[PDB]
Amino acid sequence: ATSTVTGGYAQSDAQGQMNKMGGFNLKYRYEEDNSPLGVIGSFTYTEKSRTASSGDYNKNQYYGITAGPAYRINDWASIYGVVGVGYGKFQTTEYPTYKNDTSDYGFSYGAGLQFNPMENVALDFSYEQSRIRSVDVGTWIAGVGYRF
């Protein structure tokens, strides 16, 4: 058996919305007891509550639903390119008007890389990019956890 366990942050900042890293990631992987299979799936949830002029809600979230198996290359490595989906949500209006434009899924892809130097250290790294109306966005997850 093994359990990768990880401890890293989730950032998503964009050319018009510097939504600070107010979120984490985690992952889970089983080994199949009958094949060298794995899976990975990160989840991220960032939030930073926004007022401070007079009361203008600038709510959004960034979350990245990541999915796919893990492939057994040769020796001590596993890579898998995966999908992700990274977009804003909620809106900016506050006054009785509504505005509702930027809130509908984009397209992303990532990779699952998963590395183990030690027996209480594991680290893993993914990168995703999205293009929301020509707003350049960056998303990566990195950290350090433990190794079971």
Side-chain angles (χ1 to χ4, degrees), residues 111-147:
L113 295 301
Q114 42 257 23
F115 187 90
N116 306 118
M118 225 68 70
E119 292 168 81
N120 90 310
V121 159
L123 64 177
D124 69 270
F125 289 99
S126 303
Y127 252 105
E128 272 184 61
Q129 46 164 278
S130 288
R131 290 165 164 155
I132 293 96
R133 299 189 68 172
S134 317
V135 177
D136 191 54
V137 190
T139 304
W140 82 313
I141 57 174
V144 268
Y146 305 90
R147 197 282 224 286

PDB file of all heavy atoms in Angstrom, residues 111-147:
ATOM      1  N   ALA A 111      -0.866  18.560 -15.679  1.00  0.00           N
ATOM      2  CA  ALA A 111      -0.239  17.255 -15.556  1.00  0.00           C
ATOM      3  C   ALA A 111      -0.142  16.882 -14.081  1.00  0.00           C
ATOM      4  O   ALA A 111       0.047  17.743 -13.218  1.00  0.00           O
ATOM      5  CB  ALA A 111       1.135  17.252 -16.228  1.00  0.00           C
ATOM      6  N   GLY A 112      -0.261  15.591 -13.801  1.00  0.00           N
ATOM      7  CA  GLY A 112       0.037  14.978 -12.528  1.00  0.00           C
ATOM      8  C   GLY A 112       1.486  14.529 -12.577  1.00  0.00           C
ATOM      9  O   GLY A 112       1.813  13.613 -13.338  1.00  0.00           O
ATOM     10  N   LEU A 113       2.344  15.192 -11.801  1.00  0.00           N
ATOM     11  CA  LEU A 113       3.677  14.708 -11.477  1.00  0.00           C
ATOM     12  C   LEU A 113       3.650  14.476  -9.971  1.00  0.00           C
ATOM     13  O   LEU A 113       3.072  15.285  -9.240  1.00  0.00           O
ATOM     14  CB  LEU A 113       4.739  15.768 -11.819  1.00  0.00           C
ATOM     15  CG  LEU A 113       4.944  16.159 -13.298  1.00  0.00           C
ATOM     16  CD1 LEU A 113       5.341  14.953 -14.143  1.00  0.00           C
ATOM     17  CD2 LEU A 113       3.740  16.846 -13.953  1.00  0.00           C
ATOM     18  N   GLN A 114       4.246  13.385  -9.497  1.00  0.00           N
ATOM     19  CA  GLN A 114       4.131  12.931  -8.115  1.00  0.00           C
ATOM     20  C   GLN A 114       5.446  12.257  -7.714  1.00  0.00           C
ATOM     21  O   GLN A 114       5.792  11.223  -8.290  1.00  0.00           O
ATOM     22  CB  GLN A 114       2.887  12.029  -7.947  1.00  0.00           C
ATOM     23  CG  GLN A 114       2.604  10.989  -9.055  1.00  0.00           C
ATOM     24  CD  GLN A 114       1.473  11.369 -10.024  1.00  0.00           C
ATOM     25  OE1 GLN A 114       1.119  12.534 -10.199  1.00  0.00           O
ATOM     26  NE2 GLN A 114       0.860  10.379 -10.654  1.00  0.00           N
ATOM     27  N   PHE A 115       6.210  12.848  -6.789  1.00  0.00           N
ATOM     28  CA  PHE A 115       7.571  12.421  -6.473  1.00  0.00           C
ATOM     29  C   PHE A 115       7.741  12.190  -4.967  1.00  0.00           C
ATOM     30  O   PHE A 115       7.160  12.907  -4.144  1.00  0.00           O
ATOM     31  CB  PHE A 115       8.543  13.479  -7.005  1.00  0.00           C
ATOM     32  CG  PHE A 115      10.002  13.090  -6.894  1.00  0.00           C
ATOM     33  CD1 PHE A 115      10.638  12.394  -7.941  1.00  0.00           C
ATOM     34  CD2 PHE A 115      10.728  13.423  -5.737  1.00  0.00           C
ATOM     35  CE1 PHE A 115      11.994  12.043  -7.833  1.00  0.00           C
ATOM     36  CE2 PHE A 115      12.078  13.052  -5.623  1.00  0.00           C
ATOM     37  CZ  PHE A 115      12.713  12.367  -6.670  1.00  0.00           C
ATOM     38  N   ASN A 116       8.571  11.210  -4.597  1.00  0.00           N
ATOM     39  CA  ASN A 116       8.769  10.773  -3.219  1.00  0.00           C
ATOM     40  C   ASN A 116      10.269  10.633  -2.961  1.00  0.00           C
ATOM     41  O   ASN A 116      10.852   9.627  -3.368  1.00  0.00           O
ATOM     42  CB  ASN A 116       8.065   9.420  -2.978  1.00  0.00           C
ATOM     43  CG  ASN A 116       6.593   9.422  -3.350  1.00  0.00           C
ATOM     44  OD1 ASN A 116       6.157   8.681  -4.225  1.00  0.00           O
ATOM     45  ND2 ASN A 116       5.782  10.259  -2.733  1.00  0.00           N
ATOM     46  N   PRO A 117      10.937  11.593  -2.300  1.00  0.00           N
ATOM     47  CA  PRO A 117      12.322  11.410  -1.893  1.00  0.00           C
ATOM     48  C   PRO A 117      12.430  10.567  -0.617  1.00  0.00           C
ATOM     49  O   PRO A 117      13.511  10.028  -0.365  1.00  0.00           O
ATOM     50  CB  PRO A 117      12.856  12.823  -1.644  1.00  0.00           C
ATOM     51  CG  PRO A 117      11.616  13.564  -1.151  1.00  0.00           C
ATOM     52  CD  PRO A 117      10.461  12.914  -1.919  1.00  0.00           C
ATOM     53  N   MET A 118      11.378  10.489   0.215  1.00  0.00           N
ATOM     54  CA  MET A 118      11.514  10.071   1.599  1.00  0.00           C
ATOM     55  C   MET A 118      10.193   9.479   2.092  1.00  0.00           C
ATOM     56  O   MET A 118       9.251   9.294   1.330  1.00  0.00           O
ATOM     57  CB  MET A 118      12.024  11.244   2.462  1.00  0.00           C
ATOM     58  CG  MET A 118      13.137  10.807   3.424  1.00  0.00           C
ATOM     59  SD  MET A 118      14.727  10.324   2.690  1.00  0.00           S
ATOM     60  CE  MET A 118      15.335  11.929   2.110  1.00  0.00           C
ATOM     61  N   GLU A 119      10.161   9.131   3.373  1.00  0.00           N
ATOM     62  CA  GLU A 119       9.177   8.299   4.058  1.00  0.00           C
ATOM     63  C   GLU A 119       8.380   9.159   5.052  1.00  0.00           C
ATOM     64  O   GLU A 119       7.578   8.653   5.830  1.00  0.00           O
ATOM     65  CB  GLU A 119       9.914   7.148   4.764  1.00  0.00           C
ATOM     66  CG  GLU A 119      10.546   6.149   3.784  1.00  0.00           C
ATOM     67  CD  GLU A 119      11.502   5.190   4.497  1.00  0.00           C
ATOM     68  OE1 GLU A 119      11.054   4.191   5.102  1.00  0.00           O
ATOM     69  OE2 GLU A 119      12.730   5.437   4.463  1.00  0.00           O
ATOM     70  N   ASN A 120       8.608  10.473   5.042  1.00  0.00           N
ATOM     71  CA  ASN A 120       7.778  11.493   5.668  1.00  0.00           C
ATOM     72  C   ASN A 120       7.835  12.786   4.841  1.00  0.00           C
ATOM     73  O   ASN A 120       7.538  13.866   5.348  1.00  0.00           O
ATOM     74  CB  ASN A 120       8.183  11.724   7.134  1.00  0.00           C
ATOM     75  CG  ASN A 120       9.256  12.796   7.282  1.00  0.00           C
ATOM     76  OD1 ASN A 120      10.281  12.780   6.603  1.00  0.00           O
ATOM     77  ND2 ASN A 120       8.998  13.784   8.117  1.00  0.00           N
ATOM     78  N   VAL A 121       8.222  12.708   3.565  1.00  0.00           N
ATOM     79  CA  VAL A 121       8.252  13.842   2.654  1.00  0.00           C
ATOM     80  C   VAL A 121       7.736  13.333   1.316  1.00  0.00           C
ATOM     81  O   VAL A 121       8.251  12.339   0.799  1.00  0.00           O
ATOM     82  CB  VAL A 121       9.679  14.434   2.573  1.00  0.00           C
ATOM     83  CG1 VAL A 121       9.963  15.274   1.323  1.00  0.00           C
ATOM     84  CG2 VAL A 121       9.986  15.311   3.794  1.00  0.00           C
ATOM     85  N   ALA A 122       6.742  14.022   0.760  1.00  0.00           N
ATOM     86  CA  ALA A 122       6.281  13.841  -0.600  1.00  0.00           C
ATOM     87  C   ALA A 122       5.926  15.226  -1.110  1.00  0.00           C
ATOM     88  O   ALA A 122       5.399  16.057  -0.362  1.00  0.00           O
ATOM     89  CB  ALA A 122       5.059  12.923  -0.667  1.00  0.00           C
ATOM     90  N   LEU A 123       6.214  15.458  -2.383  1.00  0.00           N
ATOM     91  CA  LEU A 123       5.927  16.704  -3.064  1.00  0.00           C
ATOM     92  C   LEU A 123       5.499  16.380  -4.482  1.00  0.00           C
ATOM     93  O   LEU A 123       5.895  15.370  -5.078  1.00  0.00           O
ATOM     94  CB  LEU A 123       7.084  17.714  -2.970  1.00  0.00           C
ATOM     95  CG  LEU A 123       8.433  17.370  -3.634  1.00  0.00           C
ATOM     96  CD1 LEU A 123       9.367  18.577  -3.462  1.00  0.00           C
ATOM     97  CD2 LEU A 123       9.125  16.142  -3.020  1.00  0.00           C
ATOM     98  N   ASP A 124       4.604  17.205  -4.992  1.00  0.00           N
ATOM     99  CA  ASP A 124       3.911  17.032  -6.251  1.00  0.00           C
ATOM    100  C   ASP A 124       3.631  18.428  -6.782  1.00  0.00           C
ATOM    101  O   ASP A 124       3.609  19.399  -6.022  1.00  0.00           O
ATOM    102  CB  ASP A 124       2.612  16.237  -6.067  1.00  0.00           C
ATOM    103  CG  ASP A 124       1.551  17.008  -5.285  1.00  0.00           C
ATOM    104  OD1 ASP A 124       1.541  16.886  -4.037  1.00  0.00           O
ATOM    105  OD2 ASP A 124       0.702  17.632  -5.956  1.00  0.00           O
ATOM    106  N   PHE A 125       3.491  18.516  -8.099  1.00  0.00           N
ATOM    107  CA  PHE A 125       3.536  19.768  -8.820  1.00  0.00           C
ATOM    108  C   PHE A 125       2.627  19.634 -10.031  1.00  0.00           C
ATOM    109  O   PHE A 125       2.821  18.717 -10.838  1.00  0.00           O
ATOM    110  CB  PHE A 125       4.981  20.032  -9.269  1.00  0.00           C
ATOM    111  CG  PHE A 125       5.978  20.391  -8.182  1.00  0.00           C
ATOM    112  CD1 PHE A 125       6.829  19.402  -7.656  1.00  0.00           C
ATOM    113  CD2 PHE A 125       6.126  21.726  -7.760  1.00  0.00           C
ATOM    114  CE1 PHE A 125       7.818  19.740  -6.717  1.00  0.00           C
ATOM    115  CE2 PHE A 125       7.118  22.065  -6.826  1.00  0.00           C
ATOM    116  CZ  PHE A 125       7.962  21.074  -6.299  1.00  0.00           C
ATOM    117  N   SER A 126       1.661  20.539 -10.178  1.00  0.00           N
ATOM    118  CA  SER A 126       0.883  20.710 -11.399  1.00  0.00           C
ATOM    119  C   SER A 126       0.863  22.194 -11.775  1.00  0.00           C
ATOM    120  O   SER A 126       1.081  23.060 -10.919  1.00  0.00           O
ATOM    121  CB  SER A 126      -0.533  20.158 -11.200  1.00  0.00           C
ATOM    122  OG  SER A 126      -0.505  18.788 -10.819  1.00  0.00           O
ATOM    123  N   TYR A 127       0.618  22.472 -13.054  1.00  0.00           N
ATOM    124  CA  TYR A 127       0.523  23.788 -13.665  1.00  0.00           C
ATOM    125  C   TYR A 127      -0.676  23.722 -14.606  1.00  0.00           C
ATOM    126  O   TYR A 127      -0.827  22.723 -15.316  1.00  0.00           O
ATOM    127  CB  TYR A 127       1.811  24.108 -14.450  1.00  0.00           C
ATOM    128  CG  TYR A 127       2.695  25.161 -13.812  1.00  0.00           C
ATOM    129  CD1 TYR A 127       3.886  24.807 -13.150  1.00  0.00           C
ATOM    130  CD2 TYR A 127       2.343  26.518 -13.929  1.00  0.00           C
ATOM    131  CE1 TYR A 127       4.719  25.806 -12.612  1.00  0.00           C
ATOM    132  CE2 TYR A 127       3.171  27.522 -13.399  1.00  0.00           C
ATOM    133  CZ  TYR A 127       4.362  27.169 -12.730  1.00  0.00           C
ATOM    134  OH  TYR A 127       5.153  28.138 -12.198  1.00  0.00           O
ATOM    135  N   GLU A 128      -1.509  24.758 -14.608  1.00  0.00           N
ATOM    136  CA  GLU A 128      -2.663  24.928 -15.483  1.00  0.00           C
ATOM    137  C   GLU A 128      -2.695  26.367 -15.987  1.00  0.00           C
ATOM    138  O   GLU A 128      -2.372  27.289 -15.237  1.00  0.00           O
ATOM    139  CB  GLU A 128      -3.942  24.660 -14.690  1.00  0.00           C
ATOM    140  CG  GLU A 128      -4.337  23.184 -14.711  1.00  0.00           C
ATOM    141  CD  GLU A 128      -5.669  23.013 -14.001  1.00  0.00           C
ATOM    142  OE1 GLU A 128      -6.678  23.593 -14.456  1.00  0.00           O
ATOM    143  OE2 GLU A 128      -5.668  22.352 -12.933  1.00  0.00           O
ATOM    144  N   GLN A 129      -3.133  26.583 -17.225  1.00  0.00           N
ATOM    145  CA  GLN A 129      -3.339  27.907 -17.797  1.00  0.00           C
ATOM    146  C   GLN A 129      -4.713  27.961 -18.465  1.00  0.00           C
ATOM    147  O   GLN A 129      -5.115  27.001 -19.129  1.00  0.00           O
ATOM    148  CB  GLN A 129      -2.191  28.266 -18.751  1.00  0.00           C
ATOM    149  CG  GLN A 129      -1.805  27.150 -19.734  1.00  0.00           C
ATOM    150  CD  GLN A 129      -0.969  27.725 -20.863  1.00  0.00           C
ATOM    151  OE1 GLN A 129      -1.519  28.283 -21.808  1.00  0.00           O
ATOM    152  NE2 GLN A 129       0.346  27.639 -20.799  1.00  0.00           N
ATOM    153  N   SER A 130      -5.394  29.099 -18.341  1.00  0.00           N
ATOM    154  CA  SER A 130      -6.692  29.386 -18.938  1.00  0.00           C
ATOM    155  C   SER A 130      -6.653  30.769 -19.585  1.00  0.00           C
ATOM    156  O   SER A 130      -5.767  31.580 -19.286  1.00  0.00           O
ATOM    157  CB  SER A 130      -7.801  29.292 -17.885  1.00  0.00           C
ATOM    158  OG  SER A 130      -8.014  27.944 -17.524  1.00  0.00           O
ATOM    159  N   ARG A 131      -7.581  31.035 -20.509  1.00  0.00           N
ATOM    160  CA  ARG A 131      -7.662  32.310 -21.221  1.00  0.00           C
ATOM    161  C   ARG A 131      -9.092  32.817 -21.115  1.00  0.00           C
ATOM    162  O   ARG A 131      -9.940  32.479 -21.941  1.00  0.00           O
ATOM    163  CB  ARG A 131      -7.279  32.096 -22.694  1.00  0.00           C
ATOM    164  CG  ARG A 131      -5.802  31.775 -22.954  1.00  0.00           C
ATOM    165  CD  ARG A 131      -5.707  31.247 -24.384  1.00  0.00           C
ATOM    166  NE  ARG A 131      -4.340  31.248 -24.911  1.00  0.00           N
ATOM    167  CZ  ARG A 131      -3.873  30.449 -25.875  1.00  0.00           C
ATOM    168  NH1 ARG A 131      -4.659  29.565 -26.480  1.00  0.00           N
ATOM    169  NH2 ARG A 131      -2.605  30.565 -26.233  1.00  0.00           N
ATOM    170  N   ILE A 132      -9.355  33.701 -20.158  1.00  0.00           N
ATOM    171  CA  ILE A 132     -10.690  34.239 -19.945  1.00  0.00           C
ATOM    172  C   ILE A 132     -10.717  35.602 -20.618  1.00  0.00           C
ATOM    173  O   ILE A 132     -10.188  36.553 -20.059  1.00  0.00           O
ATOM    174  CB  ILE A 132     -11.038  34.263 -18.437  1.00  0.00           C
ATOM    175  CG1 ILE A 132     -11.163  32.826 -17.876  1.00  0.00           C
ATOM    176  CG2 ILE A 132     -12.369  35.003 -18.217  1.00  0.00           C
ATOM    177  CD1 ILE A 132      -9.905  32.276 -17.203  1.00  0.00           C
ATOM    178  N   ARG A 133     -11.305  35.719 -21.813  1.00  0.00           N
ATOM    179  CA  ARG A 133     -11.433  36.992 -22.538  1.00  0.00           C
ATOM    180  C   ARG A 133     -10.108  37.744 -22.601  1.00  0.00           C
ATOM    181  O   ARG A 133     -10.018  38.924 -22.252  1.00  0.00           O
ATOM    182  CB  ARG A 133     -12.590  37.831 -21.972  1.00  0.00           C
ATOM    183  CG  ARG A 133     -13.906  37.068 -22.135  1.00  0.00           C
ATOM    184  CD  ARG A 133     -15.138  37.901 -21.813  1.00  0.00           C
ATOM    185  NE  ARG A 133     -15.349  38.975 -22.794  1.00  0.00           N
ATOM    186  CZ  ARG A 133     -16.441  39.739 -22.828  1.00  0.00           C
ATOM    187  NH1 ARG A 133     -17.403  39.562 -21.932  1.00  0.00           N
ATOM    188  NH2 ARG A 133     -16.555  40.682 -23.753  1.00  0.00           N
ATOM    189  N   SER A 134      -9.071  37.029 -23.035  1.00  0.00           N
ATOM    190  CA  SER A 134      -7.715  37.535 -23.208  1.00  0.00           C
ATOM    191  C   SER A 134      -7.090  38.060 -21.903  1.00  0.00           C
ATOM    192  O   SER A 134      -6.040  38.700 -21.933  1.00  0.00           O
ATOM    193  CB  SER A 134      -7.686  38.533 -24.374  1.00  0.00           C
ATOM    194  OG  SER A 134      -8.449  38.034 -25.468  1.00  0.00           O
ATOM    195  N   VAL A 135      -7.662  37.717 -20.747  1.00  0.00           N
ATOM    196  CA  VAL A 135      -7.015  37.899 -19.467  1.00  0.00           C
ATOM    197  C   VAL A 135      -6.080  36.700 -19.354  1.00  0.00           C
ATOM    198  O   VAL A 135      -6.515  35.545 -19.394  1.00  0.00           O
ATOM    199  CB  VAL A 135      -8.048  37.915 -18.320  1.00  0.00           C
ATOM    200  CG1 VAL A 135      -7.348  38.022 -16.972  1.00  0.00           C
ATOM    201  CG2 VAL A 135      -9.041  39.079 -18.440  1.00  0.00           C
ATOM    202  N   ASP A 136      -4.784  36.992 -19.276  1.00  0.00           N
ATOM    203  CA  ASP A 136      -3.756  36.018 -18.955  1.00  0.00           C
ATOM    204  C   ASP A 136      -3.930  35.584 -17.504  1.00  0.00           C
ATOM    205  O   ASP A 136      -4.046  36.461 -16.641  1.00  0.00           O
ATOM    206  CB  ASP A 136      -2.377  36.662 -19.157  1.00  0.00           C
ATOM    207  CG  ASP A 136      -1.284  35.612 -19.087  1.00  0.00           C
ATOM    208  OD1 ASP A 136      -1.414  34.628 -19.849  1.00  0.00           O
ATOM    209  OD2 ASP A 136      -0.311  35.770 -18.312  1.00  0.00           O
ATOM    210  N   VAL A 137      -3.936  34.280 -17.221  1.00  0.00           N
ATOM    211  CA  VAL A 137      -4.100  33.716 -15.880  1.00  0.00           C
ATOM    212  C   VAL A 137      -2.972  32.709 -15.657  1.00  0.00           C
ATOM    213  O   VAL A 137      -2.550  32.042 -16.607  1.00  0.00           O
ATOM    214  CB  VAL A 137      -5.491  33.047 -15.736  1.00  0.00           C
ATOM    215  CG1 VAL A 137      -5.797  32.660 -14.280  1.00  0.00           C
ATOM    216  CG2 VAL A 137      -6.626  33.954 -16.236  1.00  0.00           C
ATOM    217  N   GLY A 138      -2.501  32.580 -14.415  1.00  0.00           N
ATOM    218  CA  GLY A 138      -1.581  31.529 -14.008  1.00  0.00           C
ATOM    219  C   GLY A 138      -2.193  30.741 -12.860  1.00  0.00           C
ATOM    220  O   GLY A 138      -2.808  31.332 -11.967  1.00  0.00           O
ATOM    221  N   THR A 139      -2.032  29.423 -12.864  1.00  0.00           N
ATOM    222  CA  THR A 139      -2.382  28.542 -11.762  1.00  0.00           C
ATOM    223  C   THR A 139      -1.292  27.475 -11.656  1.00  0.00           C
ATOM    224  O   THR A 139      -0.976  26.801 -12.638  1.00  0.00           O
ATOM    225  CB  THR A 139      -3.761  27.919 -12.020  1.00  0.00           C
ATOM    226  OG1 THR A 139      -4.752  28.917 -12.237  1.00  0.00           O
ATOM    227  CG2 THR A 139      -4.234  27.051 -10.862  1.00  0.00           C
ATOM    228  N   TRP A 140      -0.725  27.284 -10.468  1.00  0.00           N
ATOM    229  CA  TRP A 140       0.111  26.138 -10.150  1.00  0.00           C
ATOM    230  C   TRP A 140      -0.195  25.739  -8.714  1.00  0.00           C
ATOM    231  O   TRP A 140      -0.639  26.570  -7.908  1.00  0.00           O
ATOM    232  CB  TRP A 140       1.610  26.442 -10.363  1.00  0.00           C
ATOM    233  CG  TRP A 140       2.323  27.164  -9.255  1.00  0.00           C
ATOM    234  CD1 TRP A 140       1.849  28.254  -8.624  1.00  0.00           C
ATOM    235  CD2 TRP A 140       3.603  26.876  -8.613  1.00  0.00           C
ATOM    236  NE1 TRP A 140       2.669  28.597  -7.570  1.00  0.00           N
ATOM    237  CE2 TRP A 140       3.773  27.782  -7.523  1.00  0.00           C
ATOM    238  CE3 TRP A 140       4.653  25.965  -8.850  1.00  0.00           C
ATOM    239  CZ2 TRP A 140       4.896  27.749  -6.685  1.00  0.00           C
ATOM    240  CZ3 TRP A 140       5.793  25.929  -8.023  1.00  0.00           C
ATOM    241  CH2 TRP A 140       5.906  26.809  -6.933  1.00  0.00           C
ATOM    242  N   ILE A 141       0.094  24.490  -8.382  1.00  0.00           N
ATOM    243  CA  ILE A 141       0.047  23.974  -7.027  1.00  0.00           C
ATOM    244  C   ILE A 141       1.424  23.395  -6.733  1.00  0.00           C
ATOM    245  O   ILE A 141       1.985  22.678  -7.569  1.00  0.00           O
ATOM    246  CB  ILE A 141      -1.115  22.975  -6.850  1.00  0.00           C
ATOM    247  CG1 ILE A 141      -1.051  21.785  -7.829  1.00  0.00           C
ATOM    248  CG2 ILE A 141      -2.456  23.724  -6.964  1.00  0.00           C
ATOM    249  CD1 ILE A 141      -2.110  20.711  -7.571  1.00  0.00           C
ATOM    250  N   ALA A 142       1.995  23.756  -5.586  1.00  0.00           N
ATOM    251  CA  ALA A 142       3.213  23.168  -5.059  1.00  0.00           C
ATOM    252  C   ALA A 142       3.108  23.128  -3.539  1.00  0.00           C
ATOM    253  O   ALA A 142       2.339  23.894  -2.940  1.00  0.00           O
ATOM    254  CB  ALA A 142       4.414  24.001  -5.498  1.00  0.00           C
ATOM    255  N   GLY A 143       3.908  22.286  -2.895  1.00  0.00           N
ATOM    256  CA  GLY A 143       3.894  22.116  -1.454  1.00  0.00           C
ATOM    257  C   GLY A 143       4.797  20.968  -1.038  1.00  0.00           C
ATOM    258  O   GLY A 143       5.577  20.459  -1.846  1.00  0.00           O
ATOM    259  N   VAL A 144       4.685  20.586   0.229  1.00  0.00           N
ATOM    260  CA  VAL A 144       5.387  19.487   0.863  1.00  0.00           C
ATOM    261  C   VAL A 144       4.416  18.913   1.899  1.00  0.00           C
ATOM    262  O   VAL A 144       3.739  19.665   2.610  1.00  0.00           O
ATOM    263  CB  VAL A 144       6.700  19.993   1.519  1.00  0.00           C
ATOM    264  CG1 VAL A 144       7.890  19.888   0.554  1.00  0.00           C
ATOM    265  CG2 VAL A 144       6.641  21.429   2.066  1.00  0.00           C
ATOM    266  N   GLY A 145       4.356  17.589   2.004  1.00  0.00           N
ATOM    267  CA  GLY A 145       3.571  16.872   2.995  1.00  0.00           C
ATOM    268  C   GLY A 145       4.405  15.750   3.580  1.00  0.00           C
ATOM    269  O   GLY A 145       5.475  16.013   4.135  1.00  0.00           O
ATOM    270  N   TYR A 146       3.921  14.516   3.467  1.00  0.00           N
ATOM    271  CA  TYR A 146       4.430  13.335   4.158  1.00  0.00           C
ATOM    272  C   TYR A 146       4.274  12.109   3.249  1.00  0.00           C
ATOM    273  O   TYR A 146       3.809  12.250   2.116  1.00  0.00           O
ATOM    274  CB  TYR A 146       3.799  13.184   5.556  1.00  0.00           C
ATOM    275  CG  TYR A 146       3.968  14.403   6.439  1.00  0.00           C
ATOM    276  CD1 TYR A 146       3.000  15.420   6.415  1.00  0.00           C
ATOM    277  CD2 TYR A 146       5.133  14.562   7.206  1.00  0.00           C
ATOM    278  CE1 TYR A 146       3.227  16.627   7.089  1.00  0.00           C
ATOM    279  CE2 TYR A 146       5.380  15.770   7.876  1.00  0.00           C
ATOM    280  CZ  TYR A 146       4.438  16.820   7.789  1.00  0.00           C
ATOM    281  OH  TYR A 146       4.690  18.013   8.382  1.00  0.00           O
ATOM    282  N   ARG A 147       4.739  10.922   3.649  1.00  0.00           N
ATOM    283  CA  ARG A 147       4.752   9.785   2.723  1.00  0.00           C
ATOM    284  C   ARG A 147       4.448   8.464   3.424  1.00  0.00           C
ATOM    285  O   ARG A 147       5.292   7.924   4.141  1.00  0.00           O
ATOM    286  CB  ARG A 147       6.087   9.821   1.970  1.00  0.00           C
ATOM    287  CG  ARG A 147       6.112   8.972   0.698  1.00  0.00           C
ATOM    288  CD  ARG A 147       6.275   7.483   1.011  1.00  0.00           C
ATOM    289  NE  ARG A 147       7.245   6.846   0.121  1.00  0.00           N
ATOM    290  CZ  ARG A 147       7.099   6.527  -1.163  1.00  0.00           C
ATOM    291  NH1 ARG A 147       5.972   6.799  -1.814  1.00  0.00           N
ATOM    292  NH2 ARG A 147       8.118   5.948  -1.777  1.00  0.00           N
TER     293      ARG A 147
END
